[PDB]
Amino acid sequence: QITNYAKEAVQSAKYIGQGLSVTFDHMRRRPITVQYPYEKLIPSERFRGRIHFEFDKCIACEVCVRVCPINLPVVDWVFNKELKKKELKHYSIDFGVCIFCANCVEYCPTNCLSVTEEYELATYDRHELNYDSVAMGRIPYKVTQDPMVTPIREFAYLPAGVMSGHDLPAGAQRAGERPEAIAN
Amino acid sequence: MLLKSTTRHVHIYAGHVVDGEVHPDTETLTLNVDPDNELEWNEAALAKVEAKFRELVANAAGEDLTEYNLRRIGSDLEHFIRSLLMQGEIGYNLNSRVRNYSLGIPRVNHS
Amino acid sequence: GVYGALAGLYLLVVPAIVYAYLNARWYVASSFERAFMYFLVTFFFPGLLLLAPFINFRPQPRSLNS
Amino acid sequence: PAILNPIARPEVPQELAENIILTSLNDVYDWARLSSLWPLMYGTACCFIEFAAMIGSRFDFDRFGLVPRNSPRQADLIITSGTITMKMAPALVRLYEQMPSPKYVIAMGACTITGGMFSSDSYSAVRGVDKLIPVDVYLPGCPPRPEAIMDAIVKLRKKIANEHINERGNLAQTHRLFTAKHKMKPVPPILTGQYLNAPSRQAPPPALAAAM
Amino acid sequence: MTILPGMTVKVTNPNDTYYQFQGIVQRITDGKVAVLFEGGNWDKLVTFQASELEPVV
Amino acid sequence: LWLPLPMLMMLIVATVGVLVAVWLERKISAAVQQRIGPEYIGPLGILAPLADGLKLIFKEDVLPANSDRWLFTLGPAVVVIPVFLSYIIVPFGQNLLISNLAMGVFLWIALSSIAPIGLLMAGYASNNKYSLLGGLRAAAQSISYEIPLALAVLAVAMMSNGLGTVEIVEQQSQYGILSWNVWRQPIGFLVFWIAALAECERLPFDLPEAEEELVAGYQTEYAGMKFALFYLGAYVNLVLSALLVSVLYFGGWSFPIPLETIANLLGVSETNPFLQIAFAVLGITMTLIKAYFFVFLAILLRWTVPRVRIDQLLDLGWKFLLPVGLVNLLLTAGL
Amino acid sequence: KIETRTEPMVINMGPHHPSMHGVLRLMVTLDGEDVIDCEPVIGYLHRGMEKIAENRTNIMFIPYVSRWDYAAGMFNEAVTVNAPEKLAGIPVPKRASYIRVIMLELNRIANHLLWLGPFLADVGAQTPFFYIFREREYIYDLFEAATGMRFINNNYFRIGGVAADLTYGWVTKCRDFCDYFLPKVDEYERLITNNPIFVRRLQGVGKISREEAINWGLSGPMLRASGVKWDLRKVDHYECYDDFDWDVPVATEGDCLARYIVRIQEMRESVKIIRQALDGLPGGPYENLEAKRMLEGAKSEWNGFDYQYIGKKLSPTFKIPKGEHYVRVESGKGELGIYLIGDDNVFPWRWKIRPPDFNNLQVLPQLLKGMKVADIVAILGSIDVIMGSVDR
Amino acid sequence: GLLAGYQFVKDLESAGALALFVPPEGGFEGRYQRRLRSKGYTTLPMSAPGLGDLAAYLTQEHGIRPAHTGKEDIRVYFQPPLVTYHLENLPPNAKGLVLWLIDGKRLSKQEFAYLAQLTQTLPKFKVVVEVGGDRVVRWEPLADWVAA
Ligand code: SF4
Ligand code: SF4
Ligand code: SF4
Structure with a gap:
């Protein structure tokens, strides 16, 4: 009646008053x-940013490929039967296909591949992410x-x-x- | 219902277009090639795909009306539009505001 | 409306003082200074909107002493 | 021939001339678009938490000016956030067609660039969203860091400021329409809107409940 | 001291997160040297400013 | 072309009044989540209301497929014209009034009644299912919070012996702060303030559809310049409703002698050139110091209460705000 | 154009779906206010995960697996490495066993912190959404220290234990966080238990009894809020969870209010298992373990088969042996299980993921039987749903 | 400052190899590839880390190896050299093209000078290698930058 609507409303007219001063005290922080x-x-x-490569350390044995989740790193190698060893000539990891799981940097004895720290690599064309062997060998x-x-x-x-x-x-x-x- | 297949270079709809508002039919199929203009066309190759579009609708005119069959046609047009590019018939657009070259990069024939 | 006497006191010379005040004590000001800071912007806003693309609050380049 | 996938030569001369004033009124056009581009609140797979972390406190989204709007009519930017399958492929090009005309999709994650780990053998993932919609800025990483998604917006603000005001005729789609009549047999739809009150749940069928 | 590709160096300065880790240098540049840290499982190389790196015999 | 000087000077302070309230929304609501807010544009975000509205002009304001054409375009033009016409009431300043209508707090409640048609001819014409469900719901919310808001003004018109909005604020100018109407109508002010907040603010509105009773509200299929009238036309009413709080209850252009110490929200010295312009423009506009406290309140009250559903939104206006609106009117009378 | 008919109105919830649990499509139909039927159209994020696993080795698959329950992360790597380590009999070092328990309990805290953000926004309060992701970035940077990524894609669990041991300032950095966060679990409990509007949105809303919640096939805090007290860590004596004392939180009411207070008390119970596992880690912290390997570098109590992070670093050509399996892990949403049957080659023959969020979803059409429209999302959010685990 | 004239167009034809120091949030870099492009110069914005050895990419044909992903052979895509291919397309009624390299701060110092000593040996061809960050966008020739 006339003796209820000024007392059945203060049950929540003062809950906002103890909700206002709480939220207004977040602005002080x-x-x-x-x-x-x-x-x-x-x-x-x-942190696993992107892969660093050393061209004179990977003797073409493709354990970077066999533990890759999707068999990504493109190892272009000849057998080179003149000097009795196999030597590559190209190494390209397609970023964009490259998840940064870093199984290549774990299963390697000769310590060739390695992870940098950079992550702000966000181009305008996907074919500009095919990093060459001298394009992965740049500085972080x-x-x-x-x-x-x-x-x-x-x-x-x-x-x-x-x-x-x-x-x-x-x-x-x-x-x-x-x-x-x-x-x- | 307007069953359709919307790829990038191919927009096959099931119905005829009456001034923008598409109405779903049961008989007809609308196709517009390159709504976004990524490939710069010409006079001949806009008529070359009609030898593949009207072939693929006529040759597959015994199956159901599902969006799996409208996609199965459109996955053959977009594999004919690429075979125009690898024969060098048409070319990419250069007025286009995006430059991602989705059907492969330009490359020379045999090094 | 005054032609050029009292208008320039509201539009130009006092909002140029607030932009010096806005750069210095904005993140390090107290819980009382911050509420007064929002009042001068909500009052000199047709003044502060004029000299908006002339002042840039980008941080100064560091010296790399290490 | 000579070159596989050749580039068509620009025969149009692009006479894009103006005075100082019309390129001063073009700076106001390009600044007001790069500084307040509103993203569609789109997210499918794991690279939405990487983008939902950027809405929050530790990295402010609305600091470059990006207020997320959850409808394609109000929004213009769309960050392709997560894997697109064969379903969600036409529900995304429908999300792209219903936007006002300066749109600027960016890709995000390794799955909308090439279909990152689902390129080797998945029977339903569209490998890269450039098979469906034109992407402005790519962004690899799995997931990209929330510091790296704000990098691709920084690269996108470099792409809005290049855009010319009088080249707005290519911002509208073209009409190369054709029409062919098929002879396919139409089928009734499969997924009508009844799950509980379907007349197949209330009772077990005969000739099988005897041994039940 | 000049740091050749193959020496074993360690960081010395205290105002840096890579504070006392040691590792092998790799790929010296015009003003910067990168050190392959080999921290635990995934060997991460971080550049440095051609100084602040005391080598180990 | 607007040869009236007072009519152009009011249209600017109804235009810069929006950009204050847009910028204040993006910095107060970013303060209470412990983030910066929009930096990098202007100095610290001052050009965020300019650049958000300027990009809405440069977009293709395209229609949906099968829609009414004359009611889509006339959709937003009925929501925003009466909230722009009703700025002709508010007399900010002692030496400024645009038009002394013999009513005007009754002309404001008359003109604010046309806005449910603008949410109806926009919810119908955009022509999908989730905008009729959202249009008929948005129309049925300005309906319920309109009778409580019109009875709060009935009480303050009983005390004022008129509806002329100069004669209202002249009754509170005899004692400075002792005769503001809030001290004499403490229960009709919350009826004004809750109902005005429930017709234009963003807490009791179904436009953010995180609850998914509809798709995105009634302004779902709108884009571009038409959407700028639903967006930069909602803060036009947030400012005007906050102005009329600080005109009716709190005394517009009324305050005691300013000759005080440095703790009066100003500089340091007594008689500077900086306080003479913080007085003379306050001797031109005193109300938009008060009117930007409730805009500061309505933004801060958005994060204070939870999002009340539409089942309990109309169980507030009819079942609570209207019976309290009645007994306030009798208590403002004798009884 | 739209007509106003007297039929039941069917609305499409849309696969756009502006929320933080993925992409469903609900063709729910309305009868004025109470819904009467609702079909979930799922499979929008089916990337073919059981067909991938037949053509991968194990160490090529651990990057793939933290994408099913991508809210959690390494709850899914725990099941994958436990398919052949529980089948080939590879013994786990006990320090790695206590290292896994720290990571799996840090994930469950980060699991319930992703559910709580969107859920409190669905039922009311919208500003605690941003103060909860602020608590989630502390768990991310702890995972960022030991593992090289934040929340998913961290090849950290191996067949022989764990990948590598922790960093140096790590155990004293939980003790900052996991003794700061525990006053805030008691803060989120007072939002819904007090303030009698949110309990007027959750009392009796989406109720299910005990016998139908076991019959429908439910696990985790949908089952335990049906008064069942079935927790797979206590049931299956799994990886040194029996060396701690802790309780299984049950609330036998069934409503959506009952699922809030289970998922709050599983945050608080996970902090108790962390504090007992950091104090029970067999070599202590790593900055003190490597010192004791230096002062007594020949052969000590340390450098045992325990007190180390992996048993034997396995070859990449590790053949999964022949024989069926079903490996259970109580994930943050329910029970997650895989069904491995392998030939003696390096690929399995079949990998049936049993998602914990798949089989909790089929009760959502039954829960939405007579419920209003305004509590559709309060049912959908309260299943702790993640599309990506459902759709796989 | 604010109102930029056309001094960036005449500075690039004079030096031949510029170096832009833009604010690191972007957006104000690209208002200078519009005055450049309004004066007939076309613009090819490449990526600086994506480019390999610039002898083999800009002036020589290079074998881009695609991702074979275990389900292909090691293909080699011999792309044509970029600067000579994008110049033969453009008719001589317009001026040359530029190479607006972005994220240019990760090129080595040898590859800066190779982008300096190539823009004179090639006629009607320029580079604008965006390098570094500053509070206000300002430019200088690459001849002064490599000696800095
Ligand atoms: S994993 Fe290491 S050793 Fe094996 S091919 Fe790659 S770089 Fe060479
Ligand atoms: S980063 Fe990961 S996916 Fe890429 S090549 Fe290395 S192991 Fe394979
Ligand atoms: S690539 Fe991985 S992290 Fe990125 S969207 Fe796909 S599944 Fe998620």
Whole structure:
């Protein structure tokens, strides 16, 4: 009646008041966001960006092909029966077909293939992703050595205690390789 | 229902086009080759596929009206449109705003 | 409407001060300064829309001391 | 012949002349399109979580200007996010045909470029979405990082600023229509909209429930 | 000290995430040197700025 | 061609009033999710309302296949003309009024009644099944929140002895902040504010179809310049409804003596050239300090409440906001 | 043009589907407000996964498998490497056994954090969607440290154990996260359990009893919210989950409110298994294990067959032996299983994935029997559905 | 600044090999391949990491090996050399073409000078190798950049 609609409404007229001051207190916090072209995020030590190649190390034995998920890396090789060894002449991994699973870099004894860190490889034509053996053998792009990036670190690379990579003036990873070599 | 087969170079519909709004029929098949203009055509090869379009509709005129059969025709036109390019009859467009060369790259014959 | 005396006080000279104020204390300003910061933009907006493509807030290039 | 898949020579001269003002009013056209292109909220396979992570907090989507709109009429950009099979192939070209005319598809992931791990032997995956729609910017990676999808938008903003205002006649589709009459026998549809109240679920059939 | 393709170097500087890892150098360039780290399973090579790398005998 | 000076100066502050409310939507709603917002365009996002609307012009505003042609185009032109005509009411400033109509808070509720036809001739004409289901639902939502909003203005017209919107805000100019109508009508203001928020804001609207009762609402098959009238014509009503809150209840152009310390949302010194222009334009526009607090509130209230469904949206307007709208009118009378 | 008839209106939910669980197509039909029939048209994302597996070796297939349950990731690599390691009798080192448990429990936390985002948006509150992906990027960067990718495509599980051991500052970096996140599981529980509007959207909405939820074939937090208490980690004594104490969360009500509180208490129970596995890891952290391999480098208690990350690094030409199999893993959506039968060559003869989200989906037409239109997505979201596991 | 004239057109015909330092978000690079293209110069935007040894790709015919994926043989697609093939198509009623390389900061220093000493030895042909990042787009010849 006239004695209910000003008391059956305060049950939710004050729930928004304890919902407004909660959401309004999210604006006081620092905006956790990683602006890409100006603050690139440093990848991990095991991140699999794209493949690096050394031309004078792969003696044409195609274990890069036999453990590939889709038999991708194109090994163009002759038998070369004059010098009693097989030597290749081309090595092309079609990116775009290339998932970055890195089975070639695991099953190799001679340590030829290797993963870089770059990922910003986004062209205008798919046939420009057929990286040649001298086009995979170029230098990586390191996100620290660029005079526009302010390269912030990742989680599990901050020091122990902090869960943000923005306002970090110094520090390192939260463990040491050899503290316990001269101690124990 | 408007059963159809929409690939990039081939848009086979089941029905005749009456000024943009397609009406689904039971007898006819509309085909427009290259709605996006990726291949620059000419006078002859726009009439060469009619020797393959009207062949494939007539030769396969004993099967059902499913979109599996409208696709099975369109997968043979787009394998005839490619055989025009590997014979060098038509060529890619260069006024086109995209340049991905979806039917293979330009390459010379025997090195 | 004043022809050129009071209009330039609203359109040009005071919004050029806010753009210096917007660059300096925007991310490091407190919980009280940020709410006042949104009021000057919602008031000098026909002033700040004029000198919009002349000032770029892109960060300064680093020196690479390492 | 001489060259397999030859390139047709431009016989049109492309007299694209203007003064300073009409290329100043072309800078306003090209800036206002690259700076606020709205993506269609499209996602099929695993490379939607990589793109849904970019909508969120750690990487801001709407920082370059990209407000995602979930209908093809309002949106213009479409990020081909995940594997397209033989089904979802005509449901995507229908999603591409119903957009206003400066569209700019980008591809995304290894499966819309070549059909990444489904190129060797899959009986229903369209190997690459350039078999269906014209792609502006490719993007390999499996999945691409959410820092790398904002790289392909950076490459796409370099493609909008190249676009000329008076070359808008190629932004409309052409009509090379033909018409042939078939002799195929029409069939009734398979998937009508009844699952529960179909008269095949309520009771077991005779000559089989005896030994049941 | 000049670093030839085949020496065993390690990073020294503390303001970098690749902080004390050692690995074999590969593919020196005009101003940069790449070091194949071989960290655990997948050997990842990261460039460096032709300095800050104390070699190991 | 608009030889009236007051009529052009109002059409600009009804045009820059949209771009404030679009930019404020993309920065307040990006503050409450801890992200930047649109950077990289303008300084910090100032050209995001310009560039979002300028790209809507340059797109092919194409029709669907089998649609009505004269009602598709006239669809958005009935939603946005009465919310643009009803800016002729709001008298921001002591020395500014465009037209002193002898009514006008009744002409505003009259003109805001034509907008359910604009959602009907757009939901019908776009001609798919999910825009009749969305058009008949969007039309049946401005219906229910219109009688509560017209009774909030009945109470504040009883106290004001008129409908002239200068004579309303002149009754609150005798005591500065003691005689604002919010202090005397604290239950008819929430009836105004909940109903006005339920006719133009983005929390009780079926346009984001994450609930999938329809496809994407009634503006699904719209594109281009027609879609810009449904999009940059929704914030025209968010500003006008927020203006009329700060005209009816909160006193338009009313405030005490400004001679205070530096804590008055201004600079540092007392008599600078910077406070004389923060006073004189405030001696021209005092209401759009208040009117951009409820636009700040309506954006912030979008993320505060959950998305109430349409089954409980019309169980709020008819069953709650209208009986409270009645007993407020009797309590504003004697009884 | 559209006409207004008195027949039941059938609407097409569309394979566009602007949501974060893939591509269905529901031809649901309406009778004013209550739906009366609903057929799911699935198979839009059938990329031919059982036909691929007949022409792959095992180590060529582990990159393929984290795409079925692509919300989780390495829940699918666990089943694939457990097809011949449980058949050829390859012994797993116990440090790798406790390393897998840390990854599988970190996936289940990241599994329920992808379900919770779109689900809370479907039933109401839209702003906690962005504060939940912020909690998901902490689990991504932990997987990014040990494995080289964020959430899928991490060839980390092997037939002989795990691929490689962890990084250095890792165990102290869960202890930051997995002791910060646990105050927030109790935060998401108070959104739906309090605020009596969301319980007016979930009480009795999509109910199923116990006996029909076992008959229809259901597993995971659709089965356990039907009062069944069947969890495959306790049932099948699987990979050192029996060395910990933990509970199986049951809520015997059946409604969609019962599936919220199971999937919240499986986040909280997964943090308890993490804290006991980090403290029970047999060599401790890796920055302390490699030191003890340096100070006593000849032969110690360390460098055993346990305290290492793999038993024997297997050849790429590893033949799956002859004999059938069915390997069960309680995934984040239900029970995930493969049916391997192999000849003695390097390829299997048949690889029948039993998806945990396939057999939870067939009750969705039965659950949508008399339910309104406004709670169609609250039923569809509450199955923890992922299209890609359904369609394979 | 804001209103750009046509100084970028005359700077490319003068130097022959430019080097653009654009903001790293893109969008303002391409307003200078429009004034370049309004003055008759066609533009072929390639990719800089995708190009192999530029002797074998720009002026020589190169064997692009396709992805055989285990279900083919090792094919070799001998593409024609790009600069001489895209110049023979263009009639002499227009000017030459440019090579607007993007992501040019990952070319080696030897391959910068080879793109510098080739644009003079080839008539009516230029390169605009977009390299580096800056707050404002500004250009300089490649002759000064390789000596920097
Ligand atoms: S895997 Fe290594 S050894 Fe084998 S072919 Fe490739 S590069 Fe050579
Ligand atoms: S990156 Fe992966 S898919 Fe590509 S060649 Fe190497 S192992 Fe094969
Ligand atoms: S390539 Fe892999 S990650 Fe990318 S969309 Fe396909 S399945 Fe998903």
